[PDB]
Each structure stands twice: as structure tokens, then as C-alpha cells.
From a paper:
Among the many virulence factors produced by Aeromonas, a Pseudomonas exotoxin A homologue, AE, was shown to be expressed and play a key role in the virulence of Aeromonas hydrophila strains causing necrotising fasciitis, likely by causing tissue damage. The tri-domain crystal structure provides strong evidence that AE is a fourth member of this toxin family.
The crystal structure of AE was solved at 2.3 Å and presents a three-domain fold similar to other diphthamide-specific mART toxins. AE crystallised in the P1211 space group with two identical molecules per asymmetric unit (rmsd of 0.62Å over 601 Cα atoms). Overall, the structure of AE presents a tri-domain architecture similar to PE and cholix with root-mean-square deviation (rmsd) of 2.5 and 2.9 Å, respectively, and includes 4 strictly conserved disulphide bridges. Importantly, this domain holds a furin protease recognition site identical to the one in PE, corresponding to sequence RQPR, with the scissile bond between R291 and G292. In the substrate-free AE structure presented here, loop 1 takes on an intermediate position, which sees the main chain of R476 and Q478 in relatively similar location to their equivalent in the NAD+-bound PE structure, with the glutamine side group within hydrogen bond distance of the adenine-phosphate. No strong anomalous signal was observed for the metal ion in the electron density map, and without any obvious metal source from the crystallisation conditions, structure refinement showed a Na+ ion was the best fit. It should be noted that although AE was crystallised at pH 5.5, it presents an overall fold similar to the structures of PE and Cholix, which were solved at pH 7.5–8.0.
Residue numbers in the entry: 15 to 227, 231 to 622
């Protein structure tokens, strides 16, 4: 009842399933060798006739069930119990089974499984989410050395009990022998995991309309069989990447990733537990604030009262209680408490609107769906099967536009390695890649780091409804007033902040509106609502208008547009010795003024 998948099915095999179960050994341990090092195994095969009524076991307690309607994946985990993922087939006929298994002592503690539905031409017509599972330690070792593929027909109305496989094979990509582990595996929990395998590059490129510019010099070495590289002409669509966490700290992990610009794989399960030593300065404090808030079971709606009372420190607190520990954590770093808790609150809110029963409790331990948003498209639709997950939209960020030079970083003493020359180069690159400047954002140092090195993310602004959005000023003097801490840190000092330059995609230009009314006036809500063709809050639109009557101009980017903005540093410094003082007009370099022409905004007739 055995077979050789990689010898018989490398081209095309028809297996008899009439007498029950068929099994093949997937021995990669021999083919790899003693020390082929750290990297990624890519197993793949095409399932043809018989592939719509099957039970496959890719290992002990990893099962695939295909009934023609769904393809379901049941796995044992390193966590509390097994998990089930279910893909609704969008098409009919042949499909590609892919699974990625990392190799090495310091390699990620998850596998990838995903399905590509094929048309008559053997091109990809539909893709599943990339399912990322923190499997049992047993599966991590087994699926990387010697694993057994069991195949059983499951009874339906089909008279015949056979399975035709083609293009069965396993490739191995060796990780470039350089770089920290953090950097090596940084794309593991993004759309760009597909970029690590030559045979899946074209799929990432075509769907996203974005280049794979990971691991320069890598070689896709076929170990056995003949893996297929399928072309696709699918209309641009979002690549979904579902991330399971054995620890169940999805919301804490995503917020930590977004606040600290730490790759989400470094906050996943570790094979060799290492503690928080490598991530002690932003990682631990941010993760601890969100964990502690959730343990109090306070609603996110009460965030403003919780922070106000913690900073006042007038009320008597029990330092032993979760409520008291949260309050100490907030005093210990007010800046990142505001940034982190407000970002977690907005994510919990968006999650609760996705479907019924998406409570605060469920958001805390939900999976994360990462979405690779197609370039040259202002709409990034998540697939319906992601309603039960925390959703992160990956768009290009400021970090990818900084050009060549030493590491840009933020401090009270000024922005490091950010010359008038480097900004000019970055600006030209942004204009050439279809962006335009809409003004200045002033903020505190930790917010600047998040916005540039990770990207703009929605923060809870429920108190100012319906005027939620990313606030920008054409005049840097207005932004400057906000480029500082809102209150004293634990050491009792208020720090100067950072001025940032905000760029939106050129396609948004039609929906950048202006008005001569004050942006929180009586009739203004309804007058702006008619101007943008729907009620506030703003979506894929901006509004520019006087902040006060006779005041300077404020620009509000709707959060759905703001997330697609690219933000880079200004060369306009904040004054470390005049914190609360006005911008010195003499400190604005002529070379930055010259590239800061605002676009012509659309007004009411
Ligand atoms: Na992200």
C-alpha cells in the first residue's frame, strides 16, 4: 500500500484508492545532508482527478479534507488544542497544494500551508489565504526530516476511487549566511514570505503589483521531484496571510509590531526561548501595557479615564492588582501608553464591526490576518473568511523611501543622518513613484518611529467624532505646536518631538477637498458631508479648512487614506531648549520650502 510521491508523481501518477489508504515517505533528511544549514523547505504537488473527495495527512495530526466545496486544514499546535482552517473553493478542477517548513535551531516555530486553484491552462485562477500555524514541536522536526503522506478517498457519489497527482516535488532555499535572526526571518509573517521561493515570486509580483525587492543571492535547489511554477493573470487582489499564535496574544503582538516596528515573527513562538532581552526598550513595555489593560477587563471606551487617573496619581491604587500594575506601567512611559493603548483600542473597535460576537475578549486572542494591498488601487478588500481575525493592511511605509545612507533615527537632539540632500533624493523618488506632498505632521518621538518605520495606523479618537483622521498642516509652524510630548514622562521631563512630511498617492488628488468654514462648526458636519458625498467620518478623502475662524489651515486625512500615506522626516528640527516655543522661521531650510508646494484642493460650488 506504499508509493514514492517524488519518483512516480514528479511528472504524473494515478494512485488506486479502492483498497483504502496509500502512504509515501517524504525523507528530506537524506537529500538535505548533515549541514545544509538554516532555510525553507517548499513541498508542492498538483491534485487532479480524485482531488475533490480526499483526506490527506501531511504528518501526525496535520490533516487536509477536500469535499469539492471546501479545503479544510486540521493541525495539532504548541498551544491549548488543535485548530481548523476552512477555505471555500472559488473554482472547480485542478489545484496546487503548497507547504513551507522552516529548517534550523533559530528558525520560526510555524509552517505555511496554502492552496492555488488552477484553470484549463494550468494558470492560478484563485488563491487561498497563506495559513500560518504554530504546530507542535513534533510536527516542526518531522516535517523537516522524514514525514509520511497518507492518502484516503472519502465516499461521495463518484464511482471511481483514484487520485491523479502531477508536478510533485520539494525545493530548499538556504538562508543567506549573514544578518541577525530577527532580520533573516522578518518577512516570515508578511505577504513577502512568497518572495523567498523563485517558484512563487510571479504570484506575489502580479497580485500585489509590487516587486519582491528578500534574501539576495538565494538559490531554489530542487531536492526531489519536479515542482511546477504556475503563471497567473488574476486581476490585482489582496494576498491574505492568517497568523495563528500558540500563546493566544494576537492583539498584544500586532500592536507591539505596529508601535515598535518589530517584525511580527520576532513576537511569535520561539523554538529557543530567549526572553525580552533583544526587545526590552519598546517590545516588552508596549506588549506589557496591552496585556495589562486586557487583564483588567475594562472596556477600551474608558482608556482616556484610565490614563488621566494614572497620571494624576491622586486616587489610592493597590499596586498588587492588575488595575494598579496598568497604572504603574502608564506612569513608567506615558508617551507609548497613549500611542500603544489608543492603537489597540482602534484595532479592537474595527474588529468588533467585522461580524457579530467580535467582543473585546475575542479580539485579545484572535488570529492576525495580514493583507498585501495591491499597488495603484486605493481599495484593499479583505476576503470574507477573515471576519473572525484582527486585520492589518500592509502598505509601503516611509522607511522604504529614505534612500541610501546610515540608519535614520529620532532623538531630542535632532533626526540622525537626515540631510537636506537625502530629503531631496527621497522627495524626487516619491514624486516618480506617484505620490504628492499634503503637508507636515508634528508628533512625539515614539509615534514618529512607528509612522516612518512601520506606517500610519489608526488610533482611537472617539471623543472628537465625527472628525477622526490623521491631522496634517500645510504650514510647518502649525504642525510644530504638536511636535512634542503631551505631558511629563516618569523622570518629569517634556521632550521636543519631530516634524514629518506626509505624502498620499496621486490617485487621491480628486478627493482632497477644502472649505472656508471652521472644521468643528455647527453646519460644518453636514456641509462637509455633502461636499464629500457621504456623512463623516472621512474615508478615502481629506478635508482642508480653518482650525479656528481666521485661524491657520488644518488637513484631516481619512484613516483609510492615511494608512496609504508615506511619511518621511522633515529637515526642520524641533528646538530642544524651547519646548512649547514657536517655530523659528529661519530654521526652515530654503531647499525644503521649495519642495513643499501643496496641491490645488477641490472646494464646494
Ligand atoms: Na505591519
Amino acid at each position: 500500500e506504499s508509493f514514492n510521491l517524488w519518483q512516480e508523481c514528479a511528472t504524473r501518477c494515478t494512485l488506486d484508492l479502492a483498497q483504502g489508504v496509500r502512504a509515501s515517505q517524504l525523507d528530506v533528511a537524506s537529500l538535505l545532508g548533515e549541514q545544509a544549514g538554516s532555510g525553507v523547505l517548499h513541498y508542492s504537488m498538483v491534485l487532479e482527478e480524485g482531488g475533490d473527495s480526499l483526506k490527506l495527512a501531511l504528518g501526525n495530526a496535520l490533516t487536509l479534507r477536500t469535499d469539492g466545496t471546501t479545503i479544510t486544514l486540521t493541525s495539532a499546535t504548541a498551544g491549548k488544542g488543535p485548530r481548523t482552517y476552512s477555505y471555500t473553493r472559488q473554482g472547480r478542477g485542478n489545484w496546487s497544494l503548497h507547504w513551507l517548513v522552516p529548517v534550523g535551531d533559530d528558525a520560526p516555530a510555524s509552517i505555511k500551508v496554502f492552496f492555488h486553484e488552477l484553470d484549463a491552462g494550468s494558470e492560478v485562477s484563485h488563491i487561498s489565504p497563506i495559513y500560518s500555524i504554530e504546530v507542535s514541536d513534533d510536527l516542526l522536526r518531522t516535517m523537516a526530516s522524514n514525514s509520511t503522506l497518507f492518502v484516503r478517498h472519502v465516499e461521495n457519489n463518484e464511482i471511481n476511487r483514484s487520485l491523479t497527482l502531477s508536478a510533485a516535488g520539494v525545493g530548499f532555499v538556504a538562508a543567506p549566511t549573514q544578518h541577525s535572526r530577527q532580520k533573516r526571518w522578518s518577512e516570515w509573517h508578511t505577504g513577502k514570505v512568497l518572495c523567498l521561493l523563485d517558484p512563487l515570486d510571479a504570484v506575489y509580483n502580479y497580485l500585489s503589483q509590487r516587486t519582491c525587492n528578500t534574501w539576495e543571492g538565494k538559490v531554489y535547489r530542487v531536492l526531489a521531484g519536479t515542482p511546477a511554477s504556475h503563471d497567473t493573470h488574476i486581476v490585482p487582489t489582496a494576498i491574505s496571510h492568517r497568523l495563528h499564535f500558540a500563546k493566544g496574544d494576537g492583539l498584544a503582538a500586532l500592536t507591539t509590531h505596529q508601535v515598535c516596528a518589530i517584525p511580527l515573527e520576532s513576537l511569535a513562538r520561539s523554538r529557543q526561548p530567549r526572553g525580552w532581552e533583544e526587545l526590552s526598550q519598546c517590545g516588552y513595555p508596549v506588549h506589557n501595557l496591552v496585556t495589562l489593560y486586557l487583564l483588567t477587563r475594562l472596556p477600551w471606551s474608558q482608556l482616556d479615564t484610565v490614563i488621566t487617573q494614572a497620571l494624576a496619581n491622586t486616587t489610592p491604587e493597590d499596586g498588587s492588582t492588575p488595575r494598579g500594575q496598568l497604572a504603574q506601567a502608564i506612569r513608567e512611559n506615558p508617551a507609548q501608553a497613549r500611542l500603544a493603548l489608543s492603537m489597540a483600542a482602534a484595532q479592537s473597535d474595527a474588529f468588533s464591526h467585522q461580524q457579530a460576537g467580535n467582543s473585546q475578549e475575542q479580539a485579545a486572542s484572535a488570529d492576525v490576518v495580514n493583507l498585501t494591498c495591491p499597488a495603484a488601487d486605493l481599495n484593499c478588500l479583505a476576503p470574507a473568511d477573515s471576519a473572525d481575525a484582527l486585520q492589518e493592511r500592509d502598505y509601503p511605509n516611509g522607511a522604504s523611501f529614505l534612500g541610501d545612507g546610515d540608519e535614520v533615527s529620532f532623538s531630542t537632539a535632532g533626526t540622525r543622518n537626515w540631510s537636506v540632500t537625502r530629503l531631496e533624493q527621497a522627495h524626487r523618488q516619491l514624486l516618480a513613484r506617484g505620490y504628492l506632498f499634503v503637508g507636515y505632521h508634528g508628533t512625539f518621538l515614539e509615534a514618529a518611529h512607528s509612522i516612518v518605520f512601520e506606517g500610519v495606523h489608526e488610533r482611537d479618537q472617539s471623543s472628537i467624532a465625527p472628525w477622526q483622521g490623521f491631522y496634517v498642516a500645510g504650514d510647518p509652524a502649525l504642525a510644530y505646536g504638536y511636535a512634542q510630548d503631551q505631558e511629563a514622562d516618569a523622570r518629569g521631563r517634556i521632550r521636543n518631538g519631530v516634524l514629518l512630511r506626509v505624502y498620499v498617492p496621486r490617485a487621491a488628488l480628486p478627493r482632497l477637498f477644502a472649505t472656508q468654514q471652521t472644521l468643528a462648526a455647527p453646519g460644518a458636519v453636514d456641509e462637509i458631508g455633502r461636499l464629500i458625498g457621504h456623512p463623516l467620518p472621512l474615508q478615502l478623502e481629506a478635508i482642508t479648512g480653518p482650525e479656528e475662524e481666521g485661524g491657520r489651515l488644518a488637513t484631516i486625512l481619512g484613516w483609510r487614506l492615511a494608512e496609504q500615506a508615506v511619511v518621511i522626516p522633515s529637515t526642520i528640527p524641533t528646538d530642544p531648549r524651547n519646548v512649547g516655543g514657536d517655530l523659528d522661521p529661519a530654521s526652515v531650510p530654503q531647499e525644503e520650502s521649495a519642495i513643499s508646494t501643496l496641491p490645488d484642493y477641490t472646494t464646494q460650488p
